[PDB]
Design a protein around this nucleic acid. Structure first.
Ligand SMILES: [Mg+2]
Ligand SMILES: [Mg+2]
Ligand SMILES: [Mg+2]
Ligand SMILES: [Mg+2]
Ligand SMILES: [Mg+2]
Ligand SMILES: [Mg+2]
Ligand SMILES: [Mg+2]
Ligand SMILES: [Mg+2]
Ligand SMILES: [Mg+2]
Ligand SMILES: [Mg+2]
Lengths: 155, 153, 177, 40, 71, 148, 108, 94, 38
RNA sequence: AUGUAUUUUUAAGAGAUAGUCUAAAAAGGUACAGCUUUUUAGAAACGGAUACAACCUUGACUAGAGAGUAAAUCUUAAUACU
């Protein structure tokens, strides 16, 4: 097998380190990070949060509008639970496909229960004489994310 | 003024000229503050004040409310106070010089370490903004900074 | 991360000047990426109603490579609008007359068909050889990877690699070459 | 996409179906009071 | 064909349904076999007792699980 | 219709709910007739429910006037300076109740197309994308063809 | 000492996986730009507007520039400046100016 | 300048459209699923006489529920409280 | 409509064509060519 | 049998009874029609066949700044006789 434009697969060859070296390297990296967390040196967290059928990018102090009614008294403080991603400037924590509750916590507040503005759904036919007009209103709920809190523990 | 307006303080206030010319509104608001200070501890009014005022700083910048016009000089002074010597402006990224809309990135270096960097429409305004940045990281007012605490000790 | 507002936004939507070398490249495979970069589709901030598109300078335009016999059978047509004013031209001829055309038509025909094509057609600069106004030289940000790996002629190979490749067949001595 | 691989591992075709994603009760009261159950 | 499918309760697509593996039914399934996907049920933990009724889930490999999500 | 109306981004009144949540509803003014049938539901509501609702919500004032009116009405007013008008006209007690509770939980903000569901200040933690961000720099910061 | 992508730019990037296995982690410190890769700031300022005889005459000589062209030509240069076509640069009609939103909404 | 006579897809002359590699794939995919199907349909649990009347109990009972369903249709009870409750219409303060 | 037998070769309905393209003859393909074998 | 919920009757009713193509079996015609004539099957999407009535995918509601899929993007090759 000499070097012909075919005989050599046209793409860079692959090397992945031995799993033991990587196990060490990993425990190392995780530890270092866990020390950044123990320290509290992360400035501001964001987290990608699954909620109410959607995914959102959440940071503290902010606002999202949920399309369905949630039963909570206005003003209640609420622990969002499903968290896919977490992040901070230096480093980032990723759920498969979720994070342990103990690993992170996000507390948001329900701000406003409301009704959506009128939407207009109109079906129509050509010269079959069929119009149907409907006006729809959707119950909506606005939450303010209060705090993203990250606890030290990771292994 | 804006705040007290939204708290219906303007609504409740006894004064001539209903629009409540702004000074009178300030006075009245802070009056409700001091009255709280007498009716409840300083510790309570602390909570209040941090709720209805500090918040209004949310999203806002440093040099938004500081207004200081020579970032460069202040930078060198605060550096002097840090026992750090000489901010050195050195150009990093540039797209177009013949453009009507060129872009510059001027980096600021202390002892060949990069302290901060900034974008701009001219090399001048770039130096300016990289300086803004440097100042921000120095003082700790930075987007990345821990968002403010709200808690009940 | 922490920037003031005016500069921050100026940075995000900043136009860029890209350079792309054409010597020995298919006008098609060139115009593909040329068009990408023109529409602004390399920028994750991209949006259609947003003006983003980046300048593109292609150089060494005369040195286009055409796969197949395409030089011979691809014809470019156009019409004056006058009766019998219709014009069919072999690609070879056209390029002979005006080096720039071939590539320009590729890129043109490759953009969406709305108005902004006309406008992004402006940010496209095309040079037969490498001769560029030091104006346009001055503002060049970055070089793009050549979209095809050009085959070397026989004469490029080092004698090391000539010897390195094994002799496949042993010729008879008697035979004359 | 990615239905295939998901299937071969034995998950749902769709990440919405029957995964822990959908199953868990995504909010609680901060007090710890378990939230009223979900219609889905 | 339509009505085979109607009397199989196969009305709504991409939805699993269960049926006897007896031949009486295989008549029907044989009629529509190109419209459908059949796969054998499997019961690894075995059959649900009454206690396990609210906990029973069905995995796409064609398997039934009795205990779903312990604590 | 979208292009018909105004819009507003999603927002808080006075950054409500951040430090402490403050019910944004200020006062309610019911106007009904002791006599007219049109007000029937709203009479019963005034009897039974109003009392307790008031206890539910200290922050709101409730002004209830029987007057010779033929169309029962309730007018919400908000700290936002905003005012909203309503008819309680010919509704049940259940109905009224639900509606007053609607008014209770509103921003006072206007009902208009809300451009996007998320209001975020400084979404950009750890950076905000700019063209150069993923480009490697060269030695001397030279151009593509520039020489030294 | 392995990352899939060069640490040339942005962040040096560390992927890792928890010994549990239910969590991926990432350590990404910013990679700052080397002083070697930098070039000096351009400095150009030159004033010849000063005439040796009278310097008020000379400092009134930098306020002495201004000019007037026609609509067509001006538009051509304008559009050769910012690399747009000649179209963007024409006025809009009365009806079209009427309907520009008087008070447009602002985020942030 | 090359035209199609008449209607595109209809007559004795048609727009030619060719099979796609994609198409070959889709078809094979379906064939696969159906090969598997007619496998799983091969080997029944019970035999034929084995399944004789094996729920004759349930099948008549469902039908007795179905019968019983229409058994029950009669006009609805009418109560005092309706006829009289219509007078709450005029309910007064005085 | 065209009769089941014609002179002119009769366009097939698409799905039948699909069926063809699937059922094409495939010749056994050798591991190593017999001629280039010893 | 079995899988399903239909079917028959009784009291009232109207419209409709001027059809198109698509696969199939047949006749007529020129083994011609976007042709005509019957029988059995299908359809008449806001998705795909660029465009499209009939072909293929799918049957349906209301809202989401969620996800999974379906049909489908377009290919296939032709040299001496010393
Ligand atoms: Mg159905
Ligand atoms: Mg036609
Ligand atoms: Mg035809
Ligand atoms: Mg026919
Ligand atoms: Mg007729
Ligand atoms: Mg008739
Ligand atoms: Mg016909
Ligand atoms: Mg029929
Ligand atoms: Mg279409
Ligand atoms: Mg549906």
């Amino acid at each position: 097998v000499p070097k012909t434009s075919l005989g050599s697969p046209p793409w860079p060859d692959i090397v992945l380190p031995d799993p033991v070296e990587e196990t060490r390297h990993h425990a190392e990296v995780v530890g270092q990070v866990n020390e950044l967390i123990a320290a509290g040196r992360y400035g501001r967290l964001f987290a990608v949060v699954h909620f109410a059928g959607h995914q959102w990018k959440v940071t503290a102090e902010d606002l999202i509008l949920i399309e369905n009614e949630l039963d909570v008294a206005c003003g209640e403080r609420i622990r969002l639970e499903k968290v896919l991603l977490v992040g901070a400037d230096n480093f980032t924590l990723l759920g498969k496909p979720l994070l342990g509750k103990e690993l992170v916590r996000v507390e948001a507040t329900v701000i406003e229960k409301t009704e959506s503005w009128p939407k207009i759904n109109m079906k129509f036919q050509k010269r079959k004489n069929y119009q149907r007009k409907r006006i729809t209103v959707n119950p909506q709920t606005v939450l303010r994310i209060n705090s993203i809190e990250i606890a030290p523990c990771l292994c | 003024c804006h705040v007290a307006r939204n708290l219906a303080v303007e609504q409740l206030a006894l004064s001539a000229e209903f629009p409540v010319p702004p000074p009178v509104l300030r006075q009245t608001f802070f009056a409700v503050i001091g009255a709280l200070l007498q009716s409840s501890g300083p510790e309570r009014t602390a909570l209040f004040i941090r709720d209805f005022l500090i918040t209004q700083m949310t999203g806002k910048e440093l040099f938004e409310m500081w207004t200081i016009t020579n970032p460069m000089g202040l930078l060198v002074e605060e550096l002097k106070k840090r026992k750090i010597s000489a901010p050195e402006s050195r150009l990093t990224r540039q797209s177009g010089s013949t453009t009507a809309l060129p872009v510059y990135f001027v980096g600021l270096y202390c002892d060949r370490k990069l302290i901060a960097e900034g974008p701009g429409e001219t090399v001048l305004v770039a130096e300016e903004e990289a300086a803004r940045v440097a100042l921000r990281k120095l003082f700790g007012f930075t987007e990345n900074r821990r968002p403010w605490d709200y808690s009940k000790p | 991360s922490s920037f003031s507002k005016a500069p921050q936004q100026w940075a995000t939507f900043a136009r860029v000047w890209y350079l792309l070398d054409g010597k020995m490249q298919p006008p098609g495979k060139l115009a593909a990426m040329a068009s990408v970069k023109l529409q602004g589709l390399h920028k994750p901030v991209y949006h259609q109603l947003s003006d983003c598109g980046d300048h593109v300078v292609i150089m060494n335009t005369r040195h286009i490579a055409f796969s197949g016999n395409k030089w011979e059978q691809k014809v470019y047509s156009s019409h004056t609008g006058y009766p019998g004013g219709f014009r069919q031209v072999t690609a070879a001829q056209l390029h002979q007359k005006d080096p720039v055309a071939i590539v320009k038509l590729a890129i043109y025909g490759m953009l969406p068909k709305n108005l902004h094509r006309r406008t992004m057609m402006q940010r496209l600069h095309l040079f037969p050889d490498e001769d560029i106004p030091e104006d346009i030289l001055k503002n060049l940000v970055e070089e793009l990877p050549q979209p095809r790996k050009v085959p070397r002629r026989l004469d490029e190979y080092t004698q090391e690699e000539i010897e390195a490749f094994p002799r496949v067949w042993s010729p008879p001595e008697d035979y004359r070459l | 996409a990615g239905s295939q691989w998901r299937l071969q591992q034995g998950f749902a075709a769709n990440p919405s179906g029957y995964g822990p994603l959908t199953e868990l009760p995504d909010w609680s009261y901060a007090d710890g009071r378990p939230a009223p159950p979900m219609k889905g | 064909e339509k009505d085979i499918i109607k009397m199989l309760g196969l009305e709504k697509a991409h939805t699993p349904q269960v049926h006897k593996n007896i031949p009486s039914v295989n008549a029907k399934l044989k009629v529509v076999k190109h419209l459908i996907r059949i796969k054998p049920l499997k019961l690894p933990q075995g059959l649900p007792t009454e206690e396990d009724m609210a906990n029973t889930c069905l995995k796409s490999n064609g398997e039934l699980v009795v205990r779903w999500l312990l604590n | 219709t979208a292009r018909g109306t105004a819009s507003r981004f999603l927002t808080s009144v006075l950054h409500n709910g951040l430090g402490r949540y403050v019910q944004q509803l200020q006062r309610l003014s019911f106007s009904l007739s002791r006599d007219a049938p049109s007000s029937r539901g709203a009479r019963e509501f005034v009897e039974r429910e109003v009392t307790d609702f008031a206890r539910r919500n200290p922050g709101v004032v409730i002004y209830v006037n029987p007057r010779p009116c033929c169309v029962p009405r309730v007018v919400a007013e908000y700290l936002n300076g905003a005012v909203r008008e309503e008819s309680i006209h010919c509704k049940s007690v259940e109905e009224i109740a639900a509606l007053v509770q609607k008014l209770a939980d509103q921003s006072g903000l206007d009902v208009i197309r809300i451009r996007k569901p998320f209001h975020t200040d400084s979404p950009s933690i750890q950076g905000q994308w700019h063209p150069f961000t993923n480009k490697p720099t060269t030695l001397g910061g030279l151009r593509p063809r520039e020489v030294q | 000492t392995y990352s899939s992508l060069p640490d040339d730019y942005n962040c040096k990037v560390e992927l890792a996986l928890t010994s549990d296995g239910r969590t991926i982690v990432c350590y990404h410190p910013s990679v700052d730009i080397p002083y070697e890769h930098t070039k000096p700031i351009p400095x150009x300022x030159x004033x010849x507007x000063x005439x040796x005889x009278x310097x008020x005459x000379x400092x009134x000589x930098x306020x002495x520039x201004x000019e007037h062209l026609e609509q067509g030509p001006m538009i051509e240069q304008l559009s050769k400046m910012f690399f747009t076509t000649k179209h963007r640069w024409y006025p809009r009609g009365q009806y079209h100016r009427r309907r520009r939103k008087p008070n447009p909404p602002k985020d942030r | 300048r090359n035209r199609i006579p008449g209607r595109q897809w209809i007559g004795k002359h048609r727009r030619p459209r060719p099979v796609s590699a994609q198409a070959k794939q889709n078809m094979i995919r379906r064939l696969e699923t159906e090969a598997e199907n007619q496998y799983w349909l091969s080997r029944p649990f019970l035999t034929a006489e084995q399944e004789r009347g094996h729920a004759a109990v349930r099948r008549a009972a469902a039908f007795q529920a179905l019968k019983a369903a229409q058994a029950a249709r009669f006009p609805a009870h009418r109560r005092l409280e309706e006829q009289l409750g219509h007078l709450l219409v005029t309910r007064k303060w005085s | 409509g065209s009769k089941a037998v014609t002179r002119h070769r009769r366009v097939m309905h698409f799905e039948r064509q699909k069926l063809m393209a699937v059922t094409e003859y495939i010749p056994p393909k050798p591991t190593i060519n017999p001629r280039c074998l010893p």
